[PDB]
Amino acid sequence: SLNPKFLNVSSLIQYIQSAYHEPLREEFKNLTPYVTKLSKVHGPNHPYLVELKETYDTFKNGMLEHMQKEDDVDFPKLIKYEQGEVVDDINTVIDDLVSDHIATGELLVKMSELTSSYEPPIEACGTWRLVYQRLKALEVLTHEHVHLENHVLFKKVS
Ligand SMILES: [Fe+3]
Ligand SMILES: [Fe+3]
Ligand SMILES: [O]
Ligand SMILES: [Zn+2]
Q: Between the chain's N and C termini, which has fewer beta carbons within 10 Å?
């Protein structure tokens, strides 16, 4: 479709915030209730469900504050850089946002692993099936969100 190579850091940052950050902040606020209900109704007979509320919660958290770092601190440094402005600290700023991505990543591996690649049992209720659906979706979206930053946005500045 549109080759991101032509997008300058400024625009690439904008797209990421309109396509990935903003839609995700809400997705959580809308998905979290369902993930909590599942660990109360079915957690007792299915421990993995209790383990996921946790993982999901700690993922949501890591992702929520890692995204808010990119908006309150790191994107400015990135646009600053594109405008040939002395920043000096960007080399490591990228190396922190890269690690942050590996962290929030292995967490997506566990959730998939716990959910048996998001494949419900024979006893999954609608909510259960719905959660798995919404969750699997939240995995690929962020996989696109992170890939874009890693292999395009960050590489531009480099
Ligand atoms: Fe981001
Ligand atoms: Fe990020
Ligand atoms: O992110
Ligand atoms: Zn079972």
A: N
